[PDB]
């Protein structure tokens with residue numbers, strides 16, 4: 210089966226400045242650093258591993274096409290789009306609104322290519338040209354709500370893709386499964402009132418954004434029951450994540466019957482990620498991808514599009530990401546070289562608090 | 578500003594601590610067959626600790642510190658904590674043209690790397706000596722390479738010599754202290770320190786750590802020492818996700834009672850910051866304010882029981898962004914000069930770790946019965 214793969218060189222050129230997360234701040238005594246948390250290198254190393262592993266030979270490279278204004282407006286307000294144009298047109302770019310998420314001059318180009326990468330892959334998987342794909346995009350998306358950029362996200366890539374599959378490809382139902390460790394508040398916002406896009410987020414409870422991602426956030430109106438948050442406790446590893454998959458996510462998808470499953474695929478739930486406290490290993494992500502791809506095979510003719518979200522371990526992210534790619538190609542050519550080191554650390558036993566957190570969500574399936 | 582409210586607080590930073598060659602790998606070596614791409618910043622790159630030093634300076638804290646030169650630990654110093662075989666092996670590895678593998682396949686010394694290892698251990702010793710004479714009331718030795726994994730007869734987990742054990746050995750043998758406590762709050766088990774003082778009740782070793790984080794299969798509460806040393810090793814393994822609340826409960830329910838029961842003449846803290854909320858090498862949720870409170874508690878304990886004699890010795894910690902602020906917070910508790918906020922405080926404050934969870938309470942409670950056997 211033909212597996213689409215998007216990497217655009219510019220994805221690795223996203224300028225993350227000289228700060229750690231916020232900018233270098235002299236009065237705060239936040240010393241400048243050359244590797245920002247969100248530095249594009251982590252995602253670049255993933256791409257390079259896809260290549261150096263030989264996975265790329267089993268992949269069909271798909272060129273990103275710049276997401277058009279029409280594309281973006283299917284997920285975002287006109288005001289946000291205008292604002293991003295405004296910010297990117299600034300001489301040296303600037304603040305997109307949150308004081309953290311920066312765009313350099315002409316940075317809109319990369320934002321368009323990131324969203325457009327998700328769209329082009331979605332387009333080609335929906336035509337049946339490809340069976341599935343991974344769009345290794347950057348900047349990420351899931352924090353961008355309808356009317357803003359946020360949390361390194363300029364546009365909500367997966368929502369742009371979903372909105373494309375809905376409006377252009379005429380699909381009635383699309384699901385976005387987001388397993389980036391942070392809450393997909395942006396995706397939740399965009400599709401809040403809309404039952405034609407089921408939005409599911411697995412995330413460390415209150416990791417980022419603050420005060421966001423409670424399971425009580427279920428959508429509104431016609432969209433009520435079509436947003437599912439699965440907030441998990443810090444220290445949740447493979448057992449908790451797979452339990453979440455098996456108890457909530459896959460039942461949710463099966464209940465909902467999407468024509469397309471889009472995965473907001475971050476790897477910041479990994480054992481080694483600085484930006485959360487979760488204990489997922491490459492094998493955990495492998496199993497999560499395997500489960501979702503199989504579900505897609507069962508319920509929507511295998512139509513599944515992975516779209517890169519977060520993840521901040523330049524050491525370990527590439528192997529987490531590679532594991533996902535291997536599940537897509539079915540070519541398994543490399544061990545996770547950290548497996549031995551991480552295997553004894555824990556996370557593979559479903560703890561009672563993990564179980565309880567997931568069980569809280571099971572009643573919500575009834576409303577799908 | 579020349580009227581200070583603190584006594585002399587020692588501070589050790591030697592330039593070479595920032596020059597430890599960590600190579601081109603992430604954690605183990607970059608390995609082409611495994612397709613582990615080389616990387617410019619190894620997890621344990623010295624920049625993280627250098628950034629801590631530069632923040633000590635740039636914040637103005639250095640103006641409230643008494644800079645203390647590291648002196649190279651002598652063979653005699655090292656030998657109070659390590660075997661002649663280990664010392665000789667480190668000399669052998671450091672004499673190799675490009676140095677090499679110290680034994681475990683990850684812990685490397687370049688040629689002449691022994692000089693830095695002696696300076697790291699010697700930094701802890703020098704500070705300890707100068708607190709002991711009363712010249713300094715307390716101090717922070719911002720040493721590198723770290724120590725706590727190195728047992729009597731090996732280098733391990735980036736540790737060449739067990740710096741705090743070298744310091745404690747010196748306090749025992751040279752300063753004639755009868756009892757020394759080593760409190761190790763680096764997030765990983767202090768297996769090395771535990772090993773060194775296993776049979777010896779004259780050094781109380783306490784480790785708080787993420788359960789089985791590193792080393793594997795190490796750091797159980799059943800590891801209690803042996804012979805006359807039985808009851809004088811205390812492991813407090815904690816669940817992943819443990820934050821300020823668990824750590825401070827650990828301090829209050831186990832650590833401080835342990836120290837009070839033991840009555841050391843000196844407290845040495847193996848001070849890592851890898852339990853921080855943003856560290857890649859553990860899953861703990863300690864913030865700078867958590868470390869502040871741990872430091873405050875431990876210094877106050879030292880004030881109460883051993884005339885304030887407390888020596889902090891740097892261990893691990895892998896957030897170049899956040900470690901400096903964790904470390905700053907601790908040093909501010911030494912000087913009482915609280916002159917800089919944690920700029921990450923609000924970002925991290927709502928993430929959690931500030932509620933003592935049942936599993937966290939329960940893990941700590943396991944250790945409480947062990948206090949009864951302390952001295």
Ligand SMILES: COC(=O)[C@H](Cc1ccc(Br)cc1)NC(=O)CCCCCCC(=O)NO
Nearest residue numbers: 546547549550604605683734763765791893
């Ligand atoms: C890619 O393989 C590794 O991860 C590498 C080698 C290893 C492999 C397997 C095991 Br079970 C243990 C170690 N492990 C390490 O380099 C472990 C470094 C220890 C980090 C802890 C340092 C610290 O802060 N101690 O307090």
Ligand SMILES: COC(=O)[C@H](Cc1ccc(Br)cc1)NC(=O)CCCCCCC(=O)NO
Nearest residue numbers: 230231309360389391417419519921923924
């Ligand atoms: C020093 O201040 C900060 O750390 C900075 C700003 C901030 C400050 C306070 C709060 Br309550 C929230 C955010 N933090 C962020 O903007 C957080 C963005 C990173 C997390 C999202 C990345 C991701 O992978 N999302 O999926």
Ligand SMILES: [Cl-]
Nearest residue numbers: 580581582583
């Ligand atoms: Cl002062």
Ligand SMILES: [K+]
Nearest residue numbers: 400403406435
């Ligand atoms: K919806």
Ligand SMILES: [K+]
Nearest residue numbers: 387389391411
């Ligand atoms: K998520």
Ligand SMILES: [K+]
Nearest residue numbers: 774777780809
């Ligand atoms: K002992």
Ligand SMILES: [K+]
Nearest residue numbers: 761763765785
């Ligand atoms: K420890």
Ligand SMILES: [Zn+2]
Nearest residue numbers: 389391477519
């Ligand atoms: Zn994320």
Ligand SMILES: [Zn+2]
Nearest residue numbers: 581582640641
């Ligand atoms: Zn002063």
Ligand SMILES: [Zn+2]
Nearest residue numbers: 763765851893
């Ligand atoms: Zn450590």
